[PDB]
Structure formats: structure tokens, C-alpha cells
């Protein structure tokens, strides 16, 4: 078996060498002749209150009006972002939740955490009460992120270093995605729902094929683990966030790392990332109570969304790009514009 | 709310806020604790691949919630930041092994120095004490695992049973071995409250109420400038 790692290292060196004869010019060279956006002035338009403990997750609805959030007091709340009303309030069986999702149709939500289960809730019932309809058991570690491919398909990320593709009607995994050595922490879908990315604590991000059920590509470059991952509107690029105050933008076909968005006045690590409707702004929530906004083409820090008094845990940009929502550990949600 | 239909939406939101207000009071009146240990340490006796379990006990009309982590992996670093709001941490140790004491000591060191576990005080139980006596009066030693036991003598020690002084010396040597780590740092933000716990030793729950009472009382003094 010792005569195998030599070849493995040789093949790894080939891969790097082959990728090395492609970086003719960095993005800055191309993009140095475009006028930047300058300054962005976004101020709070709404404040959502009613959570008891800290907030770990949220997800915008495709209506661009509704949203859902999760806190450790064991509660799900669905808001109305225009009139600041509350539409639903759902209590959980286990109070250590870590993630929430909204169906594209808008008929369902999901959540999970330190219980090794992903639950499904039905929003449209003949009786006026949100009820649990499917519990997905079979993971060995905690659930970190979940997203709905569609109404009957869901992809989950776990703390047992594996991902899975499920089938809500029967409740059995149809595919298991293995290969990560450290625990996966986040995932992002593609607009065509044919591919998805995922990051782990072993400082590696891998591309997976949903239909094939096999790894397709690998990306590297971070010193520390991966906290949150986001994906470009085209379907060609994806950007992530780590614990070392760094954020990149890797390409799929180029298979390498583009211009890096970092500054030297930031010491803490990122918690969540998101994109704008056109990819002209990159926003990331940090541990220093703030929420930075960057120029996604020229790596210029333009705009700071201050107003929280604790750690920013989540972000979100609506479908048509009108507003942004932020959650935090002081139990407040703020809608910017 | 200039419309009749919009009127009823505000009303429903108000009902939801009333329900949320009841929950806040209930949340406010409860104390959460985290339980940690190993396989040898019989923490289970003191108390379907599920991930966490919960146990509830009440003393003097006060509710305590104890969370025991179930089927998770060998890495602890990242799911431990969810517990930076608890009253205290209960650590259970099996002191009779001797050979595997290095691992409990290093787990204690990792827990005490954690970045997200600042201002969290720890309650220590030294479990299965009666088994140590039967393993030291008969004669496996401690010198072959800990060479500094031959230059240790019993200190303020109060051997309440008092049958053997050698048993007392070994007990308090283990106790000092554990308490050596606490004094190295922590700058008066969190404390350690050891106990010598027998296999059964059912005074455990009372020990917890008193320790929590002390922790909360000290916490406030610091806040008002009294300390």
C-alpha cells in the first residue's frame, strides 16, 4: 500500500501542473478598466422581533415577500416582510436546530440539528395547523444544511462526513455521497438543479453530480474549515467563507481560484455569504457584529451594514433583488434596502 | 391596515405575540446543564442512533435540564459552541483505572481552555470511589503510572470514612491532579467544584443545586462592582 501513495502524489502533482498552464492573467488584469460602483447606502427598513434565543438560519421564499427563521428556543416563525406581520409559529421536538429550508412551491419547510433527523412540515393542510409529515433518519452525525431540489426530493449535509439525496415519499436514501474526511458544513444548489457544491471541515470543497451520485471535481485553497458556500447566478462560479477571514471565487471549467476578497483589518471568520441578482455585489456576515459588502469584480470594500450587537449568523438576498435580510445572535432580524 | 382583510392579519399576529410572551417566562425560569464523560466513567448509571438525550430533575421547586450527547463522532470542537449559555458543565471521571487517567486529564484540559466555554463553571465528579479502595488495599500500584505519588502526602483533608490513610492519600492525589489544571488560568470567571463520588453515591443532585446556587450568586456580584 506504500507503493500506491507515491503514484497518488504523482497524479496530484500532474493535476496541479496541468492547471498551472492556464493562469495567463488574473482577474484584476482584465477588470482594472471598469468603473466601480463607489458607495452603497443601505439602511434598515424593518425590524422583526419575537425570538427568545439566538438565530442560526433563515431562508427567503420565491414570492420575495415571505421568509422563515429558526432559533434555539425551539421555534420556527414565518414573517411577512412588507407589513411586519407573523403568519405562522411552529414549535420543534428538539430545541437544538441548526438549519431551515423553504420549498420553491412554498408548500413546505424543513429543519434539523443535533438529533440526526431532518423533518418536513406541511404548510397547506385542510386543517389550519402546520404538521410534521416526514422524518428522515439514517445520518450518524448532526445535520448542518438542507435544501429542496423540488417537492419530493431533498439533499442533506451531515456531521458524519457524508451527504445524501433522499426521497420524501418513501423516506429512504436514493444516493449516498461519500468522500469527505472532515464534516460537511454547508451546501448550495445549481439553478438547473443538476449539480451541487459542498464544503467541509477538512478545508476542501467538492462538486457532486446528483444523477450520477459520484464526485466530479475538487477545489482547495483555504487554511481553515468551511463555514458557508454560495453559488454564482450563471452556474459557472461559486464563492465560500472560512474561519480565517478569507473569501474566494472558484470557477467550474477553469478549475482554479480567482481574485480573493480579504482585508487585513479583519481577524474573525465568516459565518454566511450570499450574492446579488447580477453578481455585482458580494455580502458576507462576520463575527465582528457587522455585515460587510464588497465589489464582486474589483475586490473593493464598499458598504458596511452595522446595527447588530452580537454575532451575525445568517444572510439572504431575495429573488428579485429588492432587499436583504440578516439574522444574529441578539435574536433580531433586520431588512435592508 | 386600511382594509377589512388586512385588519384580521394584525389581529392574528397579536395572538402569536401573546403566545410568544408565555414561552419567554417559561424559558426564563429554567437552568440548562451539559453532561460530559467517557465510556469507563459510568455517567449513564448516574443518569435508533439518536443524537442527543435530555433528562429533567427538580429540587426545591427549581427545574434543571440536563443534555447528554448521544451518537456523535469523535470530534467535539464545533458543536460545543451551541452550549455557551448553560449554567454549568458536569464532568464525570472514572478514577480507578490509573492507566487511562492521562486521557481524562487531557479531555479536562481541552474542555477548560475552550474559547467558547469561557465564563462557564464546571462541576467535577470522581466516580466509583469504592472500587479504588478494593484495588489499593489488595496491592497494581500508582507509582508505575504516576511516578510523583511517592513524594505526595495528605494535606485540610477530611477523611470522613477514615478507615485507611493510604486510600485517603490516593484519593486526594487524584483530586489534586485534576485541580492543578484549574488554577493555571480562568482569571476568576469560572470555577471548579469537585466531589468524591462513589458508584451509587446518591447525593449527586444536591451537590448540583448547591454548586449552581454558588455560581449564580457569585456571578451577580461581579456585575454590580461588589467583587
Amino acid at each position, epitope marked *: 500500500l506504500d507503493q500506491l501513495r507515491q503514484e497518488a502524489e504523482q497524479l496530484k502533482n500532474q493535476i496541479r501542473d496541468a492547471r498551472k498552464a492556464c493562469a495567463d492573467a488574473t482577474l484584476s488584469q482584465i477588470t482594472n478598466n471598469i468603473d466601480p460602483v463607489g458607495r452603497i447606502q443601505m439602511r434598515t427598513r424593518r425590524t422583526l422581533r419575537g425570538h427568545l434565543a439566538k438565530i442560526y438560519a433563515m431562508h427567503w421564499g420565491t*414570492d420575495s*415577500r*415571505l421568509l422563515v427563521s429558526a432559533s434555539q428556543d425551539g421555534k420556527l416563525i414565518i414573517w*411577512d416582510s412588507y407589513t411586519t*406581520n407573523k*403568519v*405562522h409559529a411552529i414549535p420543534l421536538r428538539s430545541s437544538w436546530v441548526m438549519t431551515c429550508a423553504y420549498a420553491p412551491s412554498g408548500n413546505y419547510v424543513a429543519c434539523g440539528g443535533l438529533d440526526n433527523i431532518c423533518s418536513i412540515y406541511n404548510l397547506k393542510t*385542510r*386543517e*389550519g*395547523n402546520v404538521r410534521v409529515s416526514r422524518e428522515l433518519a439514517g445520518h450518524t452525525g448532526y445535520l448542518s444544511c438542507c435544501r429542496f431540489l423540488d417537492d419530493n426530493q431533498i439533499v442533506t449535509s451531515s456531521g458524519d462526513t457524508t451527504c445524501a439525496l433522499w426521497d420524501i415519499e418513501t423516506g429512504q436514501q436514493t444516493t449516498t455521497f461519500t468522500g469527505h474526511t472532515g464534516d460537511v458544513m454547508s451546501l448550495s444548489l445549481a439553478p438547473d438543479t443538476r449539480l451541487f457544491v459542498s464544503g467541509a471541515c477538512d478545508a476542501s470543497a467538492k462538486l457532486w453530480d446528483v444523477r450520477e451520485g459520484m464526485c466530479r471535481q475538487t477545489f482547495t485553497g483555504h487554511e481553515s474549515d468551511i463555514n458557508a458556500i454560495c453559488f454564482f447566478p450563471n452556474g459557472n462560479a461559486f464563492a465560500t467563507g472560512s474561519d480565517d477571514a478569507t473569501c474566494r471565487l472558484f470557477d467550474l471549467r477553469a478549475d482554479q481560484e480567482l481574485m480573493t476578497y480579504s482585508h487585513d483589518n479583519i481577524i474573525c471568520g465568516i459565518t454566511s455569504v450570499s450574492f446579488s441578482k447580477s453578481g455585482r455585489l458580494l455580502l458576507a456576515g462576520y463575527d465582528d457584529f457587522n455585515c460587510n459588502v464588497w465589489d464582486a469584480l474589483k475586490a473593493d470594500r464598499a458598504g458596511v451594514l452595522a446595527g447588530h450587537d452580537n454575532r451575525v449568523s445568517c444572510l439572504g438576498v431575495t429573488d428579485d433583488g429588492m432587499a436583504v435580510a440578516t439574522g444574529s445572535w441578539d435574536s433580531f432580524l433586520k431588512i435592508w434596502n | 391596515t*386600511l*382594509s*377589512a*382583510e*388586512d*385588519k*384580521a*392579519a394584525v*389581529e*392574528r399576529s*397579536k*395572538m402569536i405575540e401573546k403566545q410568544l410572551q408565555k414561552d419567554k417566562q417559561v424559558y426564563r425560569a429554567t437552568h440548562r446543564l451539559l453532561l460530559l464523560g467517557a465510556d469507563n466513567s459510568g455517567k449513564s448509571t448516574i443518569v435508533k442512533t439518536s443524537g442527543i438525550f435530555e433528562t429533567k430533575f427538580q429540587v426545591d421547586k427549581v427545574n434543571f435540564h440536563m443534555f447528554d450527547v448521544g451518537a456523535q463522532r469523535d470530534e467535539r470542537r464545533k458543536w460545543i459552541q451551541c452550549f455557551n449559555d448553560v449554567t454549568a458543565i458536569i464532568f464525570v471521571v472514572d478514577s480507578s483505572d490509573y492507566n487511562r487517567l492521562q486521557e481524562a486529564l487531557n479531555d479536562f484540559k481541552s474542555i477548560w481552555n475552550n474559547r467558547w466555554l469561557r465564563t462557564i463553571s464546571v462541576i467535577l465528579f470522581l466516580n466509583k470511589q469504592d472500587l479504588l479502595a478494593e484495588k489499593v488495599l489488595a496491592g497494581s500500584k500508582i507509582e508505575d503510572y504516576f511516578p510523583e505519588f511517592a513524594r505526595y502526602t495528605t494535606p485540610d483533608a477530611t477523611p470522613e470514612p477514615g478507615e485507611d490513610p493510604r486510600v485517603t492519600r490516593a484519593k486526594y492525589f487524584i483530586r489534586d491532579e485534576f485541580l492543578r489544571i484549574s488554577t493555571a488560568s480562568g482569571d476568576g470567571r469560572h470555577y471548579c467544584y469537585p466531589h468524591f463520588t462513589c458508584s451509587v453515591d446518591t447525593e449527586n443532585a444536591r451537590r448540583i443545586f448547591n454548586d449552581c446556587r454558588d455560581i449564580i450568586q457569585r456571578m451577580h456580584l461581579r456585575q454590580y462592582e461588589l467583587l
Partner: single-chain antibody
Amino acid sequence: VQLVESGGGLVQPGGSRKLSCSASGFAFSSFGMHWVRQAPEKGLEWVAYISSGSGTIYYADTVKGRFTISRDDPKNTLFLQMTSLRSEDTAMYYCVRSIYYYGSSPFDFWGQGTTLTVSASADIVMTQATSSVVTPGESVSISCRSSKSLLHSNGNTYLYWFLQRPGQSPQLLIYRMSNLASGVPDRFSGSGSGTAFTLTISRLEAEDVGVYYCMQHLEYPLTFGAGTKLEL
């Protein structure tokens, strides 16, 4: 989701009756409850409204003080209290469910009602165009009319269609003038855009026979239309 009523009967003038509608099979403590009167030879008319939280109450302008309302969450039972019965106070009464949040569909589930036989203003006026008129396979168009702009500043248009079939209790076809109900076929559509409204039907089956009704939910009077029967 099924409801069974009680009460009714024939009461001599000047009497006192406690009419009731009893819920079962759903979260009755989260819906606002109505009561709607049906004249045997006329259309429908609304009488009162009780909210889920028992905080808001409206009454019919015709009868206000005499009638009383009450709900019982611990048993899921609704009541209407009627006193000093007059000649006009004899028709059919229907208990209608309704739940209000963003995207909801009020007036969706009705009961079946009961009867009560009696022996010897500035509200928006809503009117239909015709009263009766087809072939199984042709297209039908029914026109309603209003007297004030039903469009609000938010963007909503509070107009409903019901299709009370010849023999059973009413149902819901179109809520807010454009949207379709749950179990109705995808052959019905609402196309108003003016104080003049219309329900077009592409095909025509044997179940589509009945009388259509027109309602406005903009203000509390809840004035109805007149009705347009279709005959095979």
C-alpha cells in the same frame, strides 16, 4: 373537516332561539366565523362576524342589538342568539369558515345550514347583469357589477364567486377575482379589471348547472349580488 348544525324549527312571533353551528375535525380555534342568511326566493345576505381571538365583532346593519354571538373554544361550538323574532327573520342561515393571512383563501368551507319558519344605506351596491340563460360544450360568460372601485391601494380586488349548486350548500370558485379554489376544475377563470366583472367557463359539463353568486369583501356590509341560474 365536517360541520353539523342544530336549532331551527318554527317559532311563534316574539320568541327566543339560540342557533348554533358545531365544528369538528380541524383547528376551529384559529378561524373567524360568520353567519350568512339565504332568502328562499332571493340571494344571500350576511348577518354578523366573530374573530378567532374574540377581539373584534361586527353586526348586520338591519339587525344589531337583538342578535348575539358567542364561541366556545374548549368544545368548538359556535352560537347565534336570536330574540324577538319578526316576520323578516325567516330564511336559511349558513356558518362559513374564514382564515386571514397573506395568501389565504377565505370563505372556503361552508356548512349546510338549517331553516327557521316564522308565521304571521351608504354601502357599496353590487348587482348582476342578468338572471338566467346554454349548451354542453359551449362557452358561458356571467357579468357582475359594482358601484365603487373594488381595487384597493395594496393591489387586491375583493370579489368572489361561489356556485351554489341546485340542492347543496354554496362553495367557492374564485377568491379575489382571479384566483382558483382547491378542488375545482381548471376550467373556470375570473376576468374583471373594472367595476364590471365576469366568470368565463371554457367547457360545460352536467355538474356545472346552478346559480352563481357575487360578493364584495372591501367593507363590512358584505353586500351580495343577485344570482344568474344556468339551465341545461
